[PDB]
Amino acid sequence: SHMASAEHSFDVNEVIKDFPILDQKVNGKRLAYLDSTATSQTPVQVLNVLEDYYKRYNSNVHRGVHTLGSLATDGYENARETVRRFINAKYFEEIIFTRGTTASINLVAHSYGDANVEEGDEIVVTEMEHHANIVPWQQLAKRKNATLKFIPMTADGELNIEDIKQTINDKTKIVAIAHISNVLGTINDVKTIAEIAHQHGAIISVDGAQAAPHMKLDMQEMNADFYSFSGHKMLGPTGIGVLFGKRELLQKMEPIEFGGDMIDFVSKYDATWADLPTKFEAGTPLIAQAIGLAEAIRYLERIGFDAIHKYEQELTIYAYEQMSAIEGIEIYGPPKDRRAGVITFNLQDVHPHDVATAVDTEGVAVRAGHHCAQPLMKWLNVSSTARASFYIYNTKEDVDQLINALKQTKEFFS
Amino acid sequence: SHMASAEHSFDVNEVIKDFPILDQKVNGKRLAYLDSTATSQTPVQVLNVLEDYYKRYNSNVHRGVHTLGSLATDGYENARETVRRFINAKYFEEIIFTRGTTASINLVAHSYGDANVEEGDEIVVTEMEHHANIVPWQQLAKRKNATLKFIPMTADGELNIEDIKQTINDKTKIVAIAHISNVLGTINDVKTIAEIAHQHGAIISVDGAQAAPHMKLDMQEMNADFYSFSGHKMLGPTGIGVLFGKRELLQKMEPIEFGGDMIDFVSKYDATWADLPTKFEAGTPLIAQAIGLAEAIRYLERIGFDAIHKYEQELTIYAYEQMSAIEGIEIYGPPKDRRAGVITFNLQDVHPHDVATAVDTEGVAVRAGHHCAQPLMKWLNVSSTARASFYIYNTKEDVDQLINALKQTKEFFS
């Protein structure tokens, strides 16, 4: 088929050999892991770099120290440089390591938000946002008596340019938006939204958790003010994310966590802060996790995003077409050729929790629930949905295993 | 010798076989890693558990999901239970995972501090505190126009009961104190200080980063309100720590980071919070790191703290005596038999940065600088010091290698 050709061109079988977790059975059936949107699997190259760190040069990080300490510092600094190049940030000091996208957005909303939002200012969000890109803005609005505004969505769950222009105005201080929806697969035009924000004297904070794993990012082209993502969704270790911020903005923002490393001087009653980026990195860093995340970036770069985007789009269109052919499947969001590698759906007369349970019995991992997007579920007029997602280690066989399992589930519940 | 006997009894050579990082040379000399206070080394048992997680059951965490997801959730919940038992917390929900001791103390100071400290209240600290246990209290005092008070220290860097009783009064709301000093080796009587706090209607927040790796902790006996520590100092992975808090207190405290997992329900403008402990755990957890930290706890428990305390005390007394015999060495803090496994020192007429550089050329890893304790350095009337620290994988040979390197350093600079 067309999908066999896409598999062969991408060399997907050689990619899968790097992911030992996929070589197992679940409930006696081969594993078809279709939940990468929740967290990705991790290649041996990343695991080998983590093992090497702990077996060869673990130490705390500080410029000019004993031998292992200076190797650990080199590895941590090299990891930040790898991230800077990955997203084409202008400066090393514009990359902040955090616990994840959620911690990144919370740092923007506390540190930037409290210094730049007052009573009567507006913060623009959307109903497709993950909780991590809604609730911090709700809390900033409550602290400041500011107003939260939602960009109206089209019937297919996209943002029309005229709705974007009508919602952003000269009262807007912050536009906070997903680059890619974790549910609908919508790809927002963040470059254009940034331009409209900037015309009104607002800044843009982008939730890029579902974009960084899947497409090339260029902070300078996009002209985002802040951009946030998570390592565990892009082949990296748990516990690490990134906040990109323009240097001019980060310089004026105050830290919100205090301790070692982020200080320059401490007396009994006062303290001064370190330079960027360490101003925002209190305590001992995520040292092993940063080193592993840099290896995950090199894994993605070695394949390249043009190859990853083509393969993911072929998988996604194939899955969308095969799932659409099952009578009773409803897919939410844009058409097959206008979406990222996610399909959120319901099966007529079968609760999505029972879909997820049933396909796991067939070896297939999907998620069911609200996907941390309760306002989106309400916008769809549902409580829960089921969600399959694709990444670089998925195959036609994985999609066909889901399709057969859904047909078996229809039969079981009929 | 007495130290050879202690080595043999502890089976230190078998412990060292678990730490492949120690089996290397630095500058052509065997590695003598004497910087565990900064971060510990990591045994293969912990590395094997981390590798197994990524090769067998990585997935995001949620009760009742697909097979790998339910294994990851089990591992994360089991890890929290392991921590609860390790410190004898009454309830599972009193254990919060954080990024580290610094993040733990910052959560207390923001969430508990802002709700319980007002103008004219007092916060008690000490000049031996790490920056992580000073600067958050400075910032809480500034937010609230409250007053920071310091418990006077004895000439040996300890806290006299009469100075403790004179500094704590009915205005005190929070006593924030180290269990063990990262510099002096002082072991504070936190059980007694907690009693004095409680008599005055204050709470106690304990910095236990240097105690959790080295001694048995019992939250119920101690009667601490909050207790904070870091995994990387106790054989665990980087990027994880613990906050213990009494359930009654944590129930009333508000979260300070917002997103997925920590919410129950989200609408466009409002949100409700999850139950403890997840109320304080926004975003995707530190899943691999928690699982590794539980394995580190089982490694320490298998040896037991009575054996670890005896071995560390024998090493410490041996090192204190051998270093004291070098003319020109000044050791800071209490006597050899009243300290934890740390020796902070200076060598007459040799800057401590040059000591650290010189002994690294001899394969020995120590730290030089302020040790994130600038107010303590000022209290000692120095800028910088050098610091050697001991843990379960250190030997008489490591101490003798430091002693010979210090004598060689004296010679080089004379």
PDB file of C-alpha atoms in Angstrom, chain A residues 22-33 358-365 397 401 404-405 408, chain B residues 67:
ATOM      1  CA  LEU A  22       7.693  -1.659  22.179  1.00  0.00           C
ATOM      2  CA  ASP A  23       8.998  -5.286  21.980  1.00  0.00           C
ATOM      3  CA  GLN A  24       6.503  -6.766  24.412  1.00  0.00           C
ATOM      4  CA  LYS A  25       3.045  -8.198  24.710  1.00  0.00           C
ATOM      5  CA  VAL A  26       0.119  -6.775  26.727  1.00  0.00           C
ATOM      6  CA  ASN A  27      -2.792  -9.111  27.623  1.00  0.00           C
ATOM      7  CA  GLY A  28      -1.096 -11.691  25.339  1.00  0.00           C
ATOM      8  CA  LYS A  29      -1.222  -9.371  22.304  1.00  0.00           C
ATOM      9  CA  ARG A  30       1.569  -7.315  20.719  1.00  0.00           C
ATOM     10  CA  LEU A  31       1.746  -3.801  22.161  1.00  0.00           C
ATOM     11  CA  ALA A  32       0.396  -1.066  19.874  1.00  0.00           C
ATOM     12  CA  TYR A  33       1.338   2.081  21.836  1.00  0.00           C
ATOM     13  CA  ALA A 358     -11.562  -2.996  25.398  1.00  0.00           C
ATOM     14  CA  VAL A 359      -8.759  -2.017  22.997  1.00  0.00           C
ATOM     15  CA  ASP A 360      -6.142  -2.479  25.760  1.00  0.00           C
ATOM     16  CA  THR A 361      -7.384  -6.121  26.005  1.00  0.00           C
ATOM     17  CA  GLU A 362      -6.373  -6.234  22.293  1.00  0.00           C
ATOM     18  CA  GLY A 363      -2.882  -4.791  23.140  1.00  0.00           C
ATOM     19  CA  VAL A 364      -3.691  -1.207  22.032  1.00  0.00           C
ATOM     20  CA  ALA A 365      -2.853   1.747  24.306  1.00  0.00           C
ATOM     21  CA  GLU A 397       0.101  -2.625  11.867  1.00  0.00           C
ATOM     22  CA  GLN A 401      -4.679  -3.320  15.309  1.00  0.00           C
ATOM     23  CA  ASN A 404      -9.764  -4.349  14.348  1.00  0.00           C
ATOM     24  CA  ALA A 405     -10.048  -3.761  18.124  1.00  0.00           C
ATOM     25  CA  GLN A 408     -14.408  -6.114  17.994  1.00  0.00           C
TER      26      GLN A 408
ATOM     27  CA  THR B  67      -1.668  -1.704  30.885  1.00  0.00           C
TER      28      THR B  67
END
